[PDB]
Write a protein that binds this ligand. Structure first.
Ligand SMILES: CCOc1cncc(-c2ccc(C(=O)NC3(c4csc(NS(=O)(=O)C5CC5)n4)CC3)nc2)n1
Ligand SMILES: CCOc1cncc(-c2ccc(C(=O)NC3(c4csc(NS(=O)(=O)C5CC5)n4)CC3)nc2)n1
Ligand SMILES: CCOc1cncc(-c2ccc(C(=O)NC3(c4csc(NS(=O)(=O)C5CC5)n4)CC3)nc2)n1
Ligand SMILES: O=c1ccn([C@@H]2O[C@H](COP(=O)(O)OP(=O)(O)OP(=O)(O)O)[C@@H](O)[C@H]2O)c(=O)[nH]1
Ligand SMILES: O=c1ccn([C@@H]2O[C@H](COP(=O)(O)OP(=O)(O)OP(=O)(O)O)[C@@H](O)[C@H]2O)c(=O)[nH]1
Ligand SMILES: O=c1ccn([C@@H]2O[C@H](COP(=O)(O)OP(=O)(O)OP(=O)(O)O)[C@@H](O)[C@H]2O)c(=O)[nH]1
Ligand SMILES: NC(=O)CC[C@H](N)C(=O)O
Ligand SMILES: NC(=O)CC[C@H](N)C(=O)O
Ligand SMILES: NC(=O)CC[C@H](N)C(=O)O
Ligand SMILES: [Mg+2]
Ligand SMILES: [Mg+2]
Ligand SMILES: [Mg+2]
Lengths: 540, 540, 540
């Protein structure tokens, strides 16, 4: 097994996740089976505790692992399926060691950070690197480990110490360290600043790792004198100093690393034996036709709260050869209390919603913005604007429908209004979480045709609340149709509505299975419908 | 609440525990209710996982807390009773925070070392400092926290960071830091070396604590030039530089701190309002009469494996106004395989055993040295040498007795020989651990008279194995007498033998309740018997 | 004496110099006599070794100190006159201590960094803080010390250690630390990043200084959540977290600190008792009329190479109530070899030069771009465009004049062409450096009238080369006039030319004496002439 440790220097958020993923897709293009691990130095066991505001969205794996969105970057760049233990945490490691201690497995010896935590990290990394994540079922050849946080974080210390030991346990032909750093360019003096990078590399070396590539997150391309200064003060060759500058699309990021000889460096160093990315980028840079989707979100205060949702829309948009204008709406703007309190942002949000071709209502938990989602679904239903409801957006659409077409003005989810006389959405447990099979109940469903005319579908879930089986037939009588159901029949997993071009609720998360080469069918159908090309697509 | 943090500088083992305890007994003599906390930066939840070779003996508290021997130093210097949570560990803290995270109590925020672990440490210290440990039932006024390990240990970092925050949360009149350091005196150049102390204080200050006293563990009294150099290079007044040099007895250690104005410093700094130690020391330095006890131990490879046992013997010896020669015997030396393999150490151990006045067989777990304990008990029974069997030594004495006086040559504990046809000691559960009540079953018992003629006794246990109730009457028929029993009658907790000056088995651990002013009655009876003064004592 | 230490966090160049100067001008407006010290942790004794590309221009003091441009910021914000020893360096300190050691002054003791270098720094700072730098001749009340570099620089370590000692030697009412840090705002995630600031403050605290204000260099105004996160993770009150964001002019920077209560904080902390800046800013933001000056420079590759020159132009521009467009030209672009090699940048530079109202030829040393300066002066003379030649630009103008009006095609400075038969500029020594007196030789000189009709002038010099006294009368015959001469008459210090609105050479550096309220008369005359208002000005 070859190991590449990607460490972060000055700040999080400098695209270290897409660099790690690009390094992997580079090595995948070299014919290698590549796996990846994310180390998150937080004490949290999983991302299931977090809001979408903490680290961005909680990404969901087949096994029901609620994990960091960098695992979604790995899956989206590498076409692999990961498990819970590919997201390593301080919580996982300390609990492992504590449980092992209580069981007596450390044989009455004093359990310490070094060795016992640092050994546990190495054990975990070796253990997990050998697990087939590629759908081929083959053992990986390279494991790209991203160490989250910065190298100066107190939490990162045991992981860096573990990797310091690891580079002697595993040989130098099997271990490489990449350091992703920030090079500021202040508007005062106009120079690109090497100082934080040399300080960060000095910290890294003080912890016993020497960076084998230093990757500068730079806005503009690197000055020769600055690349020279980095080679000097970070004590590496010019060959080892990469600048990943701003480029036109994500699709240029592997190309930019390839151009800088990162491919050649790894093949050489690790003793080893991108035209798709080129043509995706070249098509993206030549888009003229434009589509707009209203993203009527709860978490819209931070864009990364809907990261994979946006990625799935962008896959779908590029696949239909259109540019995309995602109209990010805070759903609390559409709620009538904002009409009395701050009518400016109400009418801005409604202007955005009215001017979008399609409506996306993504997932979420809790009451805030739910009536704004219902407002947007009402608009979408009445005006016959293409609609995708994802999880919460399916649940709220079934509610919205009943509030109109059954007159159930009291109706809601039991999550929001438990004292309703029409609990059309009810708790049906813990969380239905990870991959399950949905069965298609009707050949005439638009979603079955988009899902390749398959009789079943396997998709990733993260829900407690389901549509009420008692009220099902009252809804379904009125030209709603629960076309996708669970294997038990008890859970309504996809819904369509008659006499509308595309009004679809999906109870799962299609966005987690979306790849550029294979856009998630509900998001694709939405994009197709928003351009009026869905009938043409279905006819072909 | 006033807090004193005692940090360790260069090494563990430089008497930081007895300094922390002496600081406490000083403040207790100032009229304050003093409690103490031990922070052990290990990942172990408790000391119950350890051998006696790791950190010395596992000390046991009333609540059944298996803890570090520094808690025993606290109890022995302060006359307090501690609980489990007075021994803080990294395991305890991380598990607390992880459980709290899984329960959702951190509200979807990223749980980090700073703040969440460092807050948890402060919470714990404040929480536990308010708990009455003094038998008076009053709230403490001072909490002495000993930080175990060294300040440069990776494990100590969150605790020092917690205390860095704490000194601003709690005010400077309520927080003081003592740093216990080593000053080497090499035989090469003869100078006392300040270098490790200034480096250690520099590390401590780099972590944001400034030492308010620097306590030099010095062999010889400190040179004026060296005390000057410490005041300079550790950036403190000469007033703040203590040397705790080698002195004649433990009883001189509080006096030596008192003499150096540590009393005055604390009273001043913490905005607050030893003749017993003097007379104990003065009596100790004037002992002429000498008694010898054979300590026939399993763990005798390291002396601190029987720390509180030795302390109890020394209490008892000083109380009878005799000097003590503890003949530390490795019990594997008395086992006949050593007679064939290495007869020199066999005859050395037997020479020691034969030349002792009394025999002590302390506790332990596992087979190694158990037949050597049985050998020593056989000697003690036959030669009528005063015998104290503690826990294992009670169990093995009941076995030894049966092997002779019932002819049960096969007999043992089920722990050692489960395939015996005479399991005279059997498992009777988990561990009977912490304080329970024993009831005295006979007025004529020597042990009842030593325990003040009380009908009951409360003592600290740590055993799974008990004497077999079925075989009880076969043993008791032959002039053995199980004078102390549990409240249920099922468990035999003290045994005596007829026609011997003092042959006592106790199933508990008397050594944990031993204080200088109140020597544990079984160890006192042993010492009295070994001098032949036990009849005279009982007659009075 | 009150001391304020301004430390740099993440990078140099984030305006720490103008923050230190603004803190000083704030305290000056509070009625205090303020001095300042710049510590440059480089081993260089002075800035006289440097090119203008290293740290920006070499600023010159009255005493002939060649120093960092931050001393010029101090003089320009505070209206003080500094000396050599207000620029402290590692070179100065180590040489001081070494010389003192060789003299035996350390009394046979081992001279170390701590104490002897760190004491020397404290000695120097106390010594120099008491020196009257205010033209009032009064002793300072506050000393603002800027520590150059970053806090993580190896070179900064003794200075931070010195200041760590200093805050106990000098009391807390007399010492304050400000930390100027960078808060990045990446275009990826859009968040303002606290991480480098908390890491930098953690480093600072590891070296024993706690920041009393943390000053965030932010592009945009600080988010409340980010200011909160800084207060948490940098362990200071929200009161202590300043953001110095991008603002319309330099004149807003003291106002922005005032608004954030920095005034109040210092008055409180240091136990002490801006309408000009407001009206300068308000006038600057209301400029409509625009003037352009061609800056035909050698060092124009980096703008800060001509820092005080640009400042003097901007003073002059604002004083005449015009906006300024400085047309920064690399003089090597105007040299005919660029016409053959790269004619695009030749014609760009010439287009800039032709389209400017006035021409500035600043100072420099060495041959590169000197013929381009002569090209620009030829243009300025012939086209009668307002000309200011500063030092090199005076020397080259005398040369240019002789090349035309005396036909001396071979003529140059001896610095450039020593083998000329017309050395019209010659070496006349070392460097004439610092303040000297020039005497005005003619009442009818435009420069005498601009300099208040004074018979003498005292200005700051930095030249070896002078105009040749033998060739003087050949030049002066032709309607050149050396109106300003040295007290010895041997050195030609100001030259004017007849039949031109403003063609002035000054041999000194007027830019170092320029203040916003008192623009340097040669730069003012240039700006006036470039608008055609110079006759009107002289008439009044
Ligand atoms: C160190 C990185 O440096 C730089 C430098 N310059 C630019 C970028 C950059 C970063 C993110 C983005 C981005 O997110 N773009 C979108 C998208 C579509 S598809 C996808 N990602 S994906 O599904 O994994 C697929 C690839 C396998 N992203 C439209 C939403 N676009 C540009 N990154
Ligand atoms: C920083 C310490 O520096 C120095 C300097 N010089 C000497 C010692 C020193 C350390 C330990 C010992 C020791 O262990 N002695 C014994 C004993 C009897 S009673 C008891 N401790 S006790 O029960 O808690 C009771 C007091 C409340 N210990 C005989 C076994 N004797 C001397 N310590
Ligand atoms: C931490 C600083 O943060 C920020 C935030 N936003 C903006 C600026 C900012 C920095 C520098 C400049 C600047 O250099 N401007 C000029 C000028 C004229 S006069 C003079 N300085 S001066 O002569 O000393 C006089 C004052 C006493 N400078 C025109 C050349 N303008 C804006 N600085
Ligand atoms: O990729 C990852 C994974 C985990 N984490 C972890 O999240 C926690 C926060 O680490 P950040 O770098 O987000 O720091 P911060 O929020 O204190 O500061 P700014 O964002 O304002 O710059 C730390 O515990 C870190 O290890 C990341 O930062 N990034
Ligand atoms: O071999 C050498 C050479 C030089 N020096 C130098 O002498 C100075 C003192 O270094 P020391 O190690 O003697 O330290 P100290 O006097 O502060 O402390 P103790 O002796 O009490 O332990 C330091 O500047 C060091 O580099 C030596 O210590 N030893
Ligand atoms: O204000 C000052 C004074 C002095 N110096 C000193 O200049 C030297 C360089 O310190 P810099 O911070 O300029 O670092 P660098 O050139 O290595 O990196 P970048 O500019 O690319 O970020 C160091 O010795 C420092 O102390 C400054 O940086 N700034
Ligand atoms: N994933 C989601 O969007 C959650 C929807 C809803 N709160 C549920 O628990 O079913
Ligand atoms: N505390 C001891 O000495 C233990 C004795 C024996 N191993 C038991 O478990 O009972
Ligand atoms: N200060 C300057 O511009 C220097 C001019 C010229 N090189 C001299 O030494 O005189
Ligand atoms: Mg963050
Ligand atoms: Mg020495
Ligand atoms: Mg630099």
């Amino acid at each position: 097994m070859k190991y590449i440790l990607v460490t972060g220097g000055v700040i999080s958020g400098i695209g270290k996740g897409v660099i790690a993923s690009s390094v992997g897709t580079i090595l995948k293009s070299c014919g290698l089976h590549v796996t990846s691990i994310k180390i998150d130095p937080y004490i949290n066991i999983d991302a299931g505790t977090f809001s979408p505001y903490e680290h961005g969205e909680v990404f969901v794996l087949d096994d029901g692992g609620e994990v960091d969105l960098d695992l979604g970057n790995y899956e989206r760049f590498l076409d692999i399926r990961l498990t819970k233990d590919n997201n390593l945490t301080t919580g996982k490691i300390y609990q492992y060691v504590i449980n092992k201690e209580r069981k007596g497995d450390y044989l009455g010896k004093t359990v310490q950070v070094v060795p016992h935590i640092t050994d546990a990290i190495q054990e975990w990394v070796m253990r997990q690197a050998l697990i087939p994540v590629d759908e081929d079922g083959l053992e990986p050849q390279v494991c790209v480990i991203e160490l989250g946080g910065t190298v100066g974080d107190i939490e990162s210390m045991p992981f860096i110490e573990a990797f310091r030991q690891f580079q002697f346990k595993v040989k130098r032909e099997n271990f490489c360290n990449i350091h992703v750093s920030l090079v500021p360019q202040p508007s005062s003096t106009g120079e690109q600043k090497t100082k934080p990078t040399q300080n960060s590399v000095r910290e890294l070396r003080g912890l016993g790792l020497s960076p084998d590539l230093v990757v500068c997150r730079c806005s503009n391309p690197l000055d020769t004198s600055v690349k020279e200064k980095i080679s000097m003060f970070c004590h590496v060759e010019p060959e080892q100093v990469i600048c990943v500058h701003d480029v036109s699309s994500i699709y240029r990021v592997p190309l930019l690393l390839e151009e800088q000889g990162v491919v050649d460096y790894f093949l050489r160093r690790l003793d080893l034996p991108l035209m798709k990315w080129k043509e995706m980028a070249d098509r993206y840079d030549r888009l003229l036709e434009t589509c707009s989707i209203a993203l009527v979100g709860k978490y819209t205060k931070f864009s990364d709260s809907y990261a994979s949702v946006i990625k799935a829309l962008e896959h779908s948009a590029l696949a239909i050869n259109h540019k995309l204008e995602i109209k990010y709406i805070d759903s609390t703007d559409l709620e009538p209390s904002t009409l009395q309190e701050e009518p400016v942002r109400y009418h801005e949000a409604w202007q955005k919603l009215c001017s979008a071709h399609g409506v996306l209502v993504p997932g979420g938990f809790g009451v805030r913005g739910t009536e704004g989602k219902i407002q947007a679904i009402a608009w979408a239903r009445k005006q016959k604007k293409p609609f995708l409801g994802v999880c919460l957006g399916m649940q709220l659409a079934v509610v919205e429908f009943s509030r109109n077409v059954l007159g159930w003005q009291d109706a809601n989810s039991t999550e929001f209004d438990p004292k309703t006389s029409h609990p059309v959405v009810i708790d049906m447990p813990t969380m239905r979480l990870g991959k399950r099979r949905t069965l298609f109940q009707t050949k005439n469903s638009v979603m079955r045709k988009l899902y390749g005319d398959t009789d079943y579908l396997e998709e990733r879930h993260r829900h407690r609340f389901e549509v009420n089986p008692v009220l099902k037939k009252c809804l379904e009588e009125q030209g709603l149709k629960f076309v996708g159901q669970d294997v038990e029949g008890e859970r309504m997993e996809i819904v369509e509505l008659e006499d509308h071009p595309f009004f679809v609720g999906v109870q799962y998360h299609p966005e987690f299975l979306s790849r550029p080469i294979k856009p998630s069918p509900p998001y694709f159908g939405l994009l197709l419908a928003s351009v009026g090309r869905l009938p043409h697509y279905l006819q072909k």
